[PDB]
Design an enzyme around this catalytic site. Structure first.
Site, mmCIF file in Angstrom:
data_model
loop_
_atom_site.group_PDB
_atom_site.id
_atom_site.type_symbol
_atom_site.label_atom_id
_atom_site.label_comp_id
_atom_site.label_asym_id
_atom_site.label_seq_id
_atom_site.Cartn_x
_atom_site.Cartn_y
_atom_site.Cartn_z
ATOM 1 N N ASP A 18 0.857 -1.287 0.043
ATOM 2 C CA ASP A 18 -0.025 -0.071 -0.029
ATOM 3 C C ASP A 18 0.964 1.305 0.153
ATOM 4 O O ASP A 18 2.095 1.164 -0.012
ATOM 5 C CB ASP A 18 -0.785 0.089 1.189
ATOM 6 N N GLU A 75 -8.906 -2.677 6.461
ATOM 7 C CA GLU A 75 -9.519 -2.463 7.717
ATOM 8 C C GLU A 75 -10.732 -3.226 7.919
ATOM 9 O O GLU A 75 -11.321 -3.921 7.175
ATOM 10 C CB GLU A 75 -9.831 -1.046 7.763
ATOM 11 N N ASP A 105 -5.629 -3.873 15.200
ATOM 12 C CA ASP A 105 -6.928 -4.242 15.034
ATOM 13 C C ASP A 105 -7.155 -5.771 14.146
ATOM 14 O O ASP A 105 -8.229 -6.061 13.772
ATOM 15 C CB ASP A 105 -7.893 -3.049 14.443
ATOM 16 N N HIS A 142 -5.707 -6.018 10.698
ATOM 17 C CA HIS A 142 -5.671 -5.842 9.389
ATOM 18 C C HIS A 142 -4.538 -6.350 8.499
ATOM 19 O O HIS A 142 -3.739 -6.627 9.343
ATOM 20 C CB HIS A 142 -5.868 -4.455 8.898
HETATM 21 O O1 LIG Z 1 0.074 -2.843 5.157
HETATM 22 C C1 LIG Z 1 0.776 -2.689 6.177
HETATM 23 C C2 LIG Z 1 2.289 -2.145 6.028
HETATM 24 O O2 LIG Z 1 2.695 -1.431 5.014
HETATM 25 C C3 LIG Z 1 0.214 -3.524 7.339
HETATM 26 O O3 LIG Z 1 -1.063 -4.023 7.663
HETATM 27 C C4 LIG Z 1 1.479 -3.482 8.510
HETATM 28 O O4 LIG Z 1 2.352 -4.414 8.439
HETATM 29 C C5 LIG Z 1 0.632 -3.449 9.952
HETATM 30 O O5 LIG Z 1 -0.319 -2.084 9.841
HETATM 31 C C6 LIG Z 1 1.832 -3.140 11.141
HETATM 32 O O6 LIG Z 1 2.128 -2.368 11.195
HETATM 33 P P1 LIG Z 1 3.584 -2.191 12.152
HETATM 34 O O7 LIG Z 1 3.044 -2.509 13.356
HETATM 35 O O8 LIG Z 1 4.512 -3.038 11.325
HETATM 36 O O9 LIG Z 1 4.341 -0.816 11.958
#
Ligand SMILES: O=C(CO)[C@H](O)[C@H](O)[C@H](O)COP(=O)(O)O
Ligand SMILES: O=C(CO)[C@@H](O)[C@H](O)[C@H](O)COP(=O)(O)O
Ligand SMILES: O=C(CO)[C@@H](O)[C@H](O)[C@H](O)COP(=O)(O)O
Ligand SMILES: O=C(CO)[C@@H](O)[C@H](O)[C@H](O)COP(=O)(O)O
Ligand SMILES: O=C(CO)[C@H](O)[C@H](O)[C@H](O)COP(=O)(O)O
Ligand SMILES: O=C(CO)[C@H](O)[C@H](O)[C@H](O)COP(=O)(O)O
Ligand SMILES: O=C(CO)[C@H](O)[C@H](O)[C@H](O)COP(=O)(O)O
Ligand SMILES: O=C(CO)[C@H](O)[C@H](O)[C@H](O)COP(=O)(O)O
Ligand SMILES: O=C(CO)[C@H](O)[C@H](O)[C@H](O)COP(=O)(O)O
Ligand SMILES: O=C(CO)[C@H](O)[C@H](O)[C@H](O)COP(=O)(O)O
Ligand SMILES: O=C(CO)[C@H](O)[C@H](O)[C@H](O)COP(=O)(O)O
Ligand SMILES: O=C(CO)[C@H](O)[C@H](O)[C@H](O)COP(=O)(O)O
Lengths: 266, 266, 266, 266, 266, 266
Positions: free
Chosen positions: A72, A148, A141, A143
């Site tokens: 993303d 989401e 959460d 995802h």
């Molecule tokens: O798409 C994304 C990352 O580009 C994800 O779902 C993350 O891996 C998740 O939100 C955790 O983020 P961190 O806890 O690693 O910062």
């Protein structure tokens, strides 16, 4: 699903990096048959990018024939901004390995036509055929990518509105000010991820313990999209110790027995 | 999934009708490329049929090139009976719009060979290609069409035995006498519905609050078949206020933020 | 899904056997179009194998044009061992019916290359086209075949490590000594089973009551792989009385009403 | 129970402070009949303590005849250490009000006989008769006081071992160094709290969202000791907006209409 | 607890009426030692009141030495209004039996000091000592008396705000006009009920199926106050067939065998 | 509560036996002030009874001034039948220790007035004042003593009908002939147990894994009466390894660190 129960973030990074290297080397990518790697940003993959760069510099891997796609990107965030995912990837990985600039694929969060941008990203994946290994992390959460709570389990790349919880968590990178975190992001879908040949999720910290429980012991549902992995034929979750605190003793015992040799290599 | 949180049944009808009109007009149906609309009966779609007929009479929509298919029909109920779904559809919709009689598709609950009837309904859908938008409602017990608890999530059109709970609920249309409600019905399957390009469910009243909770915050399961929408790439639930009472505050907050502009148009 | 609520194991066997016979006879298998039957081992199918052999000897069925595939087999257990699944099937079924030895398919738990063995079993199924009816049982922990807790719902034939709980349960056949029960087994996947045209599960005893509850009233998840049947278009569960003790009164009432005629034939 | 749904932590402290002052003034304490106040430490009560101080300064309340008892105290932490609860209470409250030193009751975390210390504290409360109002907060894991998960719901004041999660949470005050947070603490039991005439818990922040859901919509259990409040005749929970995110829509609606005119004071 | 599984509301009233008469006759009340009966209003007890009346007419019971206390009364509704609980009780019960006016205790929903009214009611019960048998019903949301969800399980008689759902339910008696149903009501608390020697709850209809499941198979919580009966030494639930639909098979089986000879009376 | 996580049933009996001896010696019983011990039968306490016997033989404890009360006794089973609880206790414990016959209190399962028997047992306990320590086990369905699911949590000693599952479980001692296991049994109630000063439950085997999870991590309910221990001031659960398999990782971690030095004794 495979769950690799490790102790620290350093071990997690080393196991993941090693897995990526062995897949590529076993694949023997050519210019007419590249290895397609899906990649994430965030704090979780830091030790893995570190280990990957080391192994490359030590002559163990070559990214010459590897094509990459990211999960993303923030919408409306200047590409030059140090916290954009474009900057994150270059600073932490691309600028250090021998991967050709034409082999890199990133979503344009500032694209004038959002639908077109997302559709073309899907077409680009399709022109290669498939992503051989898609690596990611998990949100507090639950995802996967930015799918989401209440995201379709058959979703494609598209724009998504970030949950207040996700923005508060990500504000740690924007001086702890949620008002500076972008409200939207272009993200690969759950269906997009389900199409990858192999999916490897990295899980670190007790902050992720409920997400890990949902993935492993919960039911398939769109509130915790990480549960889609129960439907994937080849998923692996690499975890540190704190993140497994919400699992049942029998569950962790099973995986420990299974992966004993596959991890105990000092 | 998208959930449109509205206040009243009148608003729900107006949003749904408007959505159906914009899809058709955006499609630009021709005699060689009609728009295929799936439709339901029951009390829920009353305000939507009302709004649709108005917009037609005001010159905003033309059903000339629209082919329709209904979700189900009672078995053994005379076609002339005012409460048959054939009568319901003609009285409340068909008799008021410019749709050709050859464009209408309804199941024959009095067919001598039930398997054949159901199979041919599937063939007919297939000859058009796909249903572009399938509109429906939800049962107190969570059913979509008449796919009662414990119906396969990959089911096709077939006959189903109605749950005592469904018959008691439907007796409101048969002088409040459950003994007059038919015991069986021919119904499109969950798989049939999953094949539609877009599915729009209308949810009205606190009597549907548990069904809505199951759909949005519950897991995928065959007891509450409305949960199959978590697996559809393009599902929308249009709700009034009482029906959202069982959702978590954070869930309703998310959708309200998302759909603010898409609903606040007076 | 269909659930046949019977009282005893003898009735269960008779209903299942009769269902297998009517499917085959209705199919009218030829040497150019055989009927493909998937089969299980364990204590559960004993009354069904008994009834099948009787009906064959009474001239009601002929297995001449029936091809069979078994669900799994122990790894590292000598083929001659009386408790191997090869021995189980010959002793309890094959040695008594007119099925040609070339029509029998069993996995080789002692194969030198495990991946190759599993892959070829899949190719063999594929060469026939499809399994028309796959019969099985359910584990105390909810497994279908040997797809233990946390097995992908899109899995294929492969090797699996048996859960301590499964080994303790199976030790009843190895003098009640878990140390003699094999630790691994080659098993068809959940995806493999989902590809069969019809799946019939036999459920006997209160020891299976929680597994039955999970299958019928639980959500789709990989911990209780028997829940994959909610996603199959043609699944049937044949149960005795003790096994239905964990279901809700309304659920059992529904199936009893449905199957009344289909079972009450003395 | 009563739940006061407010928006901000500023409103929470002001509502709670006004409540205490109203109870005290109505009671009209004297030397022979003092008002007994139970109090907490931590980040949650800060706005309450500030407001109480402003009110005492303005001449609205006097603590000359108020006897206080604190919920707990860290074991082994030096008394004059700024993070000891003794230090916290004097710095944040006692130093600014007219409360006599003899009216202040705190737990001696560094007593020779820890068991004698606890027994004497309980004795002290009994000598006064009853605590009229006990104010407290709630941990992320739902603990009330330091009655960690799996604490008896009939427990008395005793020594307690802190859960790893609470130490991580409390490390904020120890330079985020978990190793610096005391592992043990003397605390009042659940029965001690249930003996109070009225219990008021302040809930602030998204991090307490699940604890609030466990207290309001969950069942009574010893894992989330805050659930003990369902058994108390007069329990009040004062909350800010983010802590209410995990409650159902209908739950928060009920409380909003009940306390409408009761919170309009600004 | 005891659960009496009966089929019809006619059997329920007859079983409950016979139980009351048996308790009264065994007690052999006198002017100095009367039998104290707690009573409810609503649609559920109708068949019980009719049966009790037939029994008194036949000479089987006398209410000359029975003192009654009702559970609640609407606030602000005029006393002689036909829907006031005062009116309901005289019309349906008191008018037909020989109970002295001085033995009748009802809550004054239109008292000047509502708080004095509640305190005096509790006092009245104490003057007699104890209520020997308290009969009641159960709301759709599980309330016992009008102790709505989130009511203390140790509550006393007090004023209470009716939940929107209860008002909708009670609108049946107010020409389905929810606006006509009183918003407040004086009610006995859960502790008041738990102080009774024996509690008998009548459960009729599918609409109470979930409340019955919460009371029997659920955990004790203040959301479904009916769950308080798990804490009572002598609680009885008398049910008709439809109210038992959400219970497990084994639960209803247990109760059926326990009460077999206890309900064969017809 | 305290949970002692041990590995083997041998360690469990040794830990429990040492605990009893320590309590007794510390109490220093005499003829006028005896130590009152509550005891169980069944397979779980075997290793405890053996250890207590070895300790008495070695001169570490004397039962000369210990009064015992057993939890229950089968109704209708002849006293000298080897499976009666009277027989079990003498054979496994009383025959080997110096306890006076007058100090032994057992329930008379064959008394003329069963109701008088129960009332007198409760009276006996009261005459001594209080049971200082009550040892027990836990059924597969979570019952404590024979307080089967749906037993009041405030119950007293009374007659009880055994659940079909318990009879199947107990058939092990009746040649696996369920028909031979007594259907009724006199048992102490939950309130009787909650009146004891300390309660120690021994948990052994995978079959008790769910009962242990219900007691530790579940909510208080009358279906799993063992959950009553959350309400007791001093409850201890002594477990072997397999019984802990259904608990969360963090739960067992907490208890392991709390009891580390408390179980190192071997
Ligand atoms: O798409 C994304 C990352 O580009 C994800 O779902 C993350 O891996 C998740 O939100 C955790 O983020 P961190 O806890 O690693 O910062
Ligand atoms: O014993 C106490 C306080 O004396 C605790 O239960 C805290 O109330 C709770 O841990 C909240 O801590 P804060 O989040 O308010 O710091
Ligand atoms: O306080 C009362 C009755 O005095 C209530 O708890 C009712 O028993 C319950 O609301 C059932 O109402 P019906 O369904 O019987 O009318
Ligand atoms: O009343 C009793 C014992 O006197 C029961 O609760 C047993 O403790 C329980 O049924 C365990 O039985 P075992 O598994 O130990 O045989
Ligand atoms: O671009 C996304 C559209 O897909 C939207 O703003 C919608 O809210 C969406 O329908 C929800 O998400 P999914 O169900 O697609 O995850
Ligand atoms: O297939 C049907 C309708 O033809 C549906 O499942 C109904 O939409 C549902 O049963 C609700 O019915 P109403 O509440 O709208 O009457
Ligand atoms: O015609 C339907 C058959 O599909 C039947 O009477 C069966 O009871 C059915 O097998 C159940 O329904 P599904 O699983 O197909 O929903
Ligand atoms: O793959 C196997 C059998 O070859 C199965 O999952 C069994 O049907 C199940 O483990 C039950 O075994 P029984 O209880 O019938 O012995
Ligand atoms: O051969 C099987 C591999 O599939 C393994 O030992 C793995 O542990 C596996 O990845 C888990 O199982 P599934 O997810 O494939 O069920
Ligand atoms: O001093 C406390 C003892 O009361 C202990 O360390 C124990 O761990 C205790 O038994 C558990 O706590 P409660 O069950 O008493 O909460
Ligand atoms: O008169 C009652 C007060 O007891 C009130 O309006 C409150 O709302 C009450 O605190 C809640 O009810 P309980 O917790 O007392 O049920
Ligand atoms: O002798 C006992 C009565 O106390 C009975 O057979 C009843 O079944 C009882 O009411 C249920 O048990 P408890 O609720 O008392 O556990």
């Amino acid at each position: 699903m495979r769950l690799i129960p490790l102790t620290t973030a350093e071990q997690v990074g080393k196991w993941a990096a090693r897995h990526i290297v062995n897949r590529i080397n076993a694949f023997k990518p050519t210019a007419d048959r590249p290895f397609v790697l899906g990649l994430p940003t965030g704090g979780t993959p830091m030790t893995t990018y570190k280990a990957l760069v080391e192994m490359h510099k030590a002559g163990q891997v070559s990214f010459k024939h590897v094509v990459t796609f990211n999960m993303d990107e923030y919408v409306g965030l200047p590409k030059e901004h140090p916290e954009s995912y474009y900057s994150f990837m270059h600073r932490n990985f691309f600028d250090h390995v021998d991967i050709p600039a034409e082999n890199i694929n990133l979503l344009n969060g500032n694209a004038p036509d959002i639908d077109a941008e997302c559709r073309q990203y899907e077409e680009k994946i399709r022109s290669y055929g498939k992503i051989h290994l898609f690596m990611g992390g998990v949100g507090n959460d639950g995802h996967i990518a930015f799918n989401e709570p209440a995201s379709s389990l058959a979703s494609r790349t598209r724009i998504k509105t970030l949950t207040h919880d996700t923005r508060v968590a990500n504000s740690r990178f924007f001086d702890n000010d949620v008002n500076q975190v972008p409200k939207y992001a272009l993200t690969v879908g759950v269906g997009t991820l389900l199409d990858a040949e192999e999916v490897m999720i990295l899980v670190l910290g007790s902050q992720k313990a409920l997400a890990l429980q949902a993935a492993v012991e919960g039911c398939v549902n769109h509130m915790w999209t990480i549960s889609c992995l129960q439907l994937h034929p080849k998923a692996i979750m690499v975890c540190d110790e704190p993140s497994t605190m919400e699992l049942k003793v029998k569950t962790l015992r099973y995986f420990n027995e299974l992966e004993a040799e596959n991890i105990k290599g000092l």
